[PDB]
């Protein structure tokens, strides 16, 4: 196995760290590769990739509420955009710290829509998530005016050997009188007290909404998001119940039909 | 080092859904740990067919030699081998005994699936693995699989038993719900105990009760962790 293949594997592992365990996974891989130069040069991308993939929320000094690190905010040169506070900031992927906030020109013909959606979503997120954060981007892709709503929520409890994270990304492609709606909802949970058990799930959403006033549409968008996310959470709950009451039970009995543990001398006859 | 310790730590964290690819990636990353990783990283059990006896048997590292695997029924390697590692005559007789006993255990608790027991000599006794593999019938669009890997060390009037048991549990469904949902992985537990060895309480009975007690316990714990704990975590995400 070549050094190039070793570092590709190292980068892959790093990018597959479960939520809240990036440092542990990074350290393991670093000690296994045992070549800091190779790691630096061949897995440099892996830190940024992971953070943006995970919608890592970061706190900026002087601004309440946090902002999500996502591909949509990547300003290059190690800086990221906070469309709500109209700022750019430096972000260190390794130390996961923001620094050097600077006013950033955010003006756009999407400006007022991004803002109406953002204020509505922020309220939706405070209500629906215990530890939620959201970042809404307004940009033109392929000339099409698009609102990109990103939601993150996590609960890290390494001391109880578990971490979990929700991520949702909603894309509204505006084409009056109708907006095209695409979304990906994701959940990952990791439990590892004397084991390694993980829930991995995601659902793709495809839909459309009537577009009207800036304010009314925001209401429409958030209503779509709410119905979809509740539906998904409900379906997940339904799967758990079915896995518990049907599949798990059928895999192994609690006790043999005798309703007593096995008499092993008998079995040996 | 320490590389072994990190390797195991990494397998505790990388998604179990890619458990097989994880291991071979890890072997590629650190070629020198190959034997250690192959023996200490548990992997889903594979079913092979013993053409001679017309019975299924389970593949894992413990019945492997080179690229071939030993059937517990015919006691032969497939692909055939000139000098494949075999159990002594004494231990082979016990192994056949254990396979017969755990076959009935399998039927009693799992009402299906496949079982296999492989034994091997130790300095002051012997060890063995008891493997059970059971696939779900796929009802309600849920695919399920249960793997038992019970590894026992016996130090030989009375004997000391050390049991390290891993159960793997995989649940998956692709309802439009819901979208893709995968809930899987494994739990490991360990027990130790001295017990009398006698006519009425031979080694196979002693190991039997140990495996049964352990597995009943783990079944209950899987229920709590999979359907209690991970669900509670989801609900608080929320």
């Amino acid at each position: 196995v070549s050094d190039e293949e070793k570092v590709r594997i190292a980068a892959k592992f790093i990018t597959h760290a479960p939520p809240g365990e990036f440092n542990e996974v990074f350290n393991d891989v670093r000690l296994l590769l045992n070549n800091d130069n190779l790691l630096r040069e061949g897995a440099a991308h892996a830190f940024a990739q992971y953070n943006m993939d995970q919608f890592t929320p970061v706190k900026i000094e002087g601004y309440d509420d946090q902002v999500l690190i996502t591909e949509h905010g990547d300003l290059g040169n190690g800086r990221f955009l906070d469309p709500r506070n109209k700022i750019s900031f430096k972000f260190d992927h390794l130390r996961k710290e923001a620094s050097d906030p600077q006013p950033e020109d955010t003006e756009s013909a999407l400006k007022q829509w991004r803002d109406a959606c953002d204020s509505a979503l922020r309220a939706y997120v405070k209500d629906h998530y215990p530890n939620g954060f959201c970042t809404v981007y307004g940009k033109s892709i392929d000339g099409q005016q698009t609102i990109i709503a990103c939601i993150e929520s996590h609960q890290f409890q390494p001391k109880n050997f578990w971490n979990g994270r929700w991520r949702s990304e909603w894309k509204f492609t505006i084409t009056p009188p109708t907006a095209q709606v695409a979304a990906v909802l994701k959940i990952q949970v990791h439990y590892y007290e004397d084991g390694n058990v993980q829930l991995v799930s995601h659902k793709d959403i495809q839909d459309s909404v009537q577009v009207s006033s800036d304010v009314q549409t925001a209401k429409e968008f958030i209503k779509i998001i709410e119905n979809a996310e509740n539906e998904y959470q409900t379906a997940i709950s339904e799967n758990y119940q079915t896995m518990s009451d049907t599949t798990f039970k059928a895999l192994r009995r609690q006790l043999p039909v005798t309703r007593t543990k096995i008499d092993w001398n008998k079995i040996l006859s | 080092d320490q590389q072994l310790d990190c390797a195991l730590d990494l397998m505790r964290r990388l998604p179990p859904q890619q458990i097989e690819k994880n291991l071979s990636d890890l072997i590629d990353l650190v070629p020198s740990l190959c034997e250690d990783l192959l023996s200490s990283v548990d992997q889903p059990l594979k079913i092979a067919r013993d053409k001679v006896v017309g019975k299924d048997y389970l593949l894992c590292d413990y019945n492997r030699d080179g690229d071939s695997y030993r059937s517990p029924w015919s006691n032969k390697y497939d692909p055939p081998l000139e000098d494949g590692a075999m159990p002594s005559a004494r231990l082979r007789k016990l192994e056949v005994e254990a396979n017969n006993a755990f076959d009935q255990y399998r039927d009693l608790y799992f009402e299906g699936g496949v079982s296999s027991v492989y034994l091997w000599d130790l300095d002051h006794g012997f060890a063995g693995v008891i493997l059970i593999k059971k696939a779900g019938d796929g009802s309600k669009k849920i695919k399920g699989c249960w793997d038992s890997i019970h590894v026992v060390e016996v130090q030989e009037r009375t004997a000391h038993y050390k049991l390290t048991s891993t159960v793997m549990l995989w649940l998956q469904t692709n309802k439009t719900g819901s979208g893709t949902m995968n809930l899987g992985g494994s739990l490991t537990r360990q027990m130790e105990k001295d017990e009398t060895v006698s006519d009425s309480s031979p080694h196979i009975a002693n190991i039997g009760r140990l495996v049964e007690d352990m597995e009943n316990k783990i079944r209950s714990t899987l229920n709590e962790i999979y359907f209690g704990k991970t669900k509670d975590i989801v609900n608080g995400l929320r």
């Binding site: 004397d194 | 072994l4 310790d5 730590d9 505790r12 034997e35 080179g66 590692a85 490991t188």
Partner: peptide, 29 residues
């Protein structure tokens, strides 16, 4: 950029590490 900066996996305990080993078997190719 510094890597000793990133701390730190104090490793979990590994129950499978101490199971009886069956030494002296050929590796796969």
């Amino acid at each position: 950029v510094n890597f000793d900066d990133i701390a730190s996996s104090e490793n979990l305990l590994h129950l499978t590490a101490n199971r009886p080993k069956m030494p002296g078997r050929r590796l796969p190719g």
